[PDB]
Symmetry: none
Subunit: 129 residues, 4 copies
């Protein structure tokens, strides 16, 4: 219902950071997934300060909300990722979350961090792979 997605710091600025998440745009989650990259500008994530406030830092997340596509039904045209660290202070539950997310989803996200500007060129900060 609120399942885990990988997210990662894609850019770091003085006042905020940009996180990119790997999300499934299918409304029906049982189908083969339709992967996309979703970005979000974030000011603060507990635990992410200083030496971990770096491009490439892993952030376990969930897709908290989305909006349906007009032309399609069956697809989300917008998806908001949130770090699970906003919901729990517990380091081991966050650590668990990270290991639970498939390594291959982690690697897919890592390989696409460099597409940040392509993603930000879309109208809802969502770019289908």
């Amino acid at each position: 219902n609120y399942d885990l997605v990988p997210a990662m710091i894609a850019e770091v600025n003085p006042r905020d950071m940009v996180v990119m998440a790997l999300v499934n745009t299918n409304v029906d989650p049982t189908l083969p997934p339709r992967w996309a990259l979703a970005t979000r500008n974030i000011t603060a994530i507990p635990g992410i300060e200083g030496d971990t406030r770096k491009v490439g830092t892993r952030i376990p997340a969930v897709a908290v909300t989305g909006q349906r596509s007009v032309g399609n039904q069956d697809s989300w045209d917008q998806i908001s990722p949130m770090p699970i660290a906003w919901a729990t202070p517990d380091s081991s539950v966050i650590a668990r979350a990270e290991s639970t997310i498939p390594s291959e989803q982690w690697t897919t996200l890592s390989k696409n961090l460099n597409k940040l500007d392509q993603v930000r060129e879309t109208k809802f900060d969502l770019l289908e792979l």
Copy 2:
């Protein structure tokens, strides 16, 4: 009142949006569909690639003059892009999905009526 709008023309230093609006003052009646146009310069989020004829722009129908003859209807309605208030992607995406797909289709099919709309007194043409 949420309405679909769409970029109908793009020029070097301005653009024109067209909206599909209901001119009846009584919203409980079957809609009295009309096309309304507005010359604008910029919309937050509408940059380069997405700045083209056909791009969807959710809007609100700002009503003006009303009069009563054979119908009680608005004589002027001006679309205001929602992104003028906030370009938040959840807001704009939700607004687009809240507008019935039939209205988006109707607007896109009438997009070529721009010159006819601009020939009316208030840039408003009942369909």
Copy 3:
């Protein structure tokens, strides 16, 4: 389903929000008012000064387990801050104003029932 929530406790590395929720499954009935709490760490926009007991946080009531005895009601309801989806100021301000002032007042008056709520099975206490 939009509900008022409020910071009920602030700790070094976490905080607790309380929401005023309706536990009836049938929304056409007079509400069955309850208080629901959730331990969270952070909310976009809730930083330093505004991070204190009493701060208003508009939320949605995420429903869980339902069962039918003398009433058909939700056994679990968890508030989710709207700012988790987007901290856009128009969104958060509109959501706060959309929730009746009577509900905000009721929540603020019951804010001191935190320990009683946390003593229930699902952090949900019918009023």
Copy 4:
């Protein structure tokens, strides 16, 4: 109905600018005004590039939307300013707008540009004077 407010560039960054506007938080505009500062992060304003993309540049604006206060009625607790340059390409209508806004409102705004960080410390980017 959509009346003119002064706005001014309060901060300039690589990807965007922050504009501050002087707004009236009274829902009833006939009353003596209840002045406040409202800020907004803006990516692009026609005409504002390069030498005019500077802290202190005047931007004629209107208060396009607002949200009511919960405890009060009679007050807006959030107000979105927009540059009139988003609505018209015509340099003289924008120039007119600027001269139409009272000089004293201009000066009040100029004198408070330095309160940017106070305004951004509020929950809806609105600080009553």
